[PDB]
């Protein structure tokens, strides 16, 4: 059983500190880059930070630089996020996600841990709709340093669930993703196509890519898909 | 520069132990991966590597000094990926075994230097974006 489980979430005062942990099970943790991705209640996914297998390469989103510190202890199969100088805008569910070495897709995600303290570079249309059996298309717009230079990944987030890898390397499906889902990339744009819409496809969809200028992962704002 | 120094240690250590025939943290894990992947590329491309060796005709120190030329010209097609990089290092190990048979053990160190030079000089930006030797280990994890 390959899993991740986040811990340490809770209520904190602005200016306060909190340390998150993520426990990895069923895999060789020391051979993977790991990431933190957060989600403010009712808002899109926001990438936070990433750390390579031997901690040699660390990256932070602009919104957390100087305040958050990522670390890992491979002997304890553990990923950490030390958050200092917490702000109201840091309120979110924090997800731990394993990165695939060959593709950079986030294939395993934890359930998340809620942190309560009391703009996206890729763009997507906020909504999409269709009737069962119809074909729907969701676009993801980027630029030269991200989609124009790097592959695109798509994540599906069903209501009340953690995101799941849907598409990687622009158009590849992981095992367990039906062939009704497909992806394409052209220039600085990408698109997710869902053929023969099904009731269970009602979800939020996010595209993501590495950005060479920002030295950060950039997630799209998300598209809420309704099946009428 | 930490990247050149680290890359040199890994590649030289790998080429030396491949010549000798006896196995000797980020660098450590990169070496374990390179032994697994590199020995695999050498077995799978043994005939192609033999042909490249005869064509290059490495018999002394002066041939090792001119070996960098081919490496820069193969990378001139604008293609960069870990597969190409590990093929270059595995070919370097193959040449280091041949150098050991013709009593040219002293040529392994400049050969390692030459491979590292071409790699770190022409592909520094790509290597850095790919998380260097951490990315090398992650890319080939099985």
Numbering used by the authors:
A (entry chain X): 1 to 118, 136 to 245
B (entry chain A): 172 to 195, 204 to 321
Report text from the authors:
Mcl-1 is an anti-apoptotic member of the Bcl-2 family which binds to pro-apoptotic proteins containing the BH3 domain, a short α-helical stretch of around 16 residues. Binding of Mcl-1 to the pro-apoptotic proteins prevents apoptosis. Here, we report the characterization of an antibody fragment produced in vitro against Mcl-1 which was formatted as an scFv and a Fab.
In common with the previous structures of Mcl-1, density for Ser196–Gly203 was also missing in the refined structure. These residues are part of a flexible loop between helices 1 and 2 (residues 196–204) that contains the mouse–human substitutions. To make comparison between the scFv and Fab easier, all of the following descriptions of the scFv are annotated using the Fab heavy-chain (H) and light-chain (L) amino-acid numbering. The guanidinium head group is coordinated via a network of water molecules and Gln99-H and Trp99-L. Comparing the conformation of Arg310 of Mcl-1 in the scFv structure with all other Mcl-1 PDB depositions shows a wide variation of side-chain conformations beyond the Cγ atom, suggesting that Arg310 is mobile until captured by the epitope interaction. A further intramolecular interaction between His320 and Glu322 of Mcl-1 extends via a water bridge to Arg98-H in the scFv.
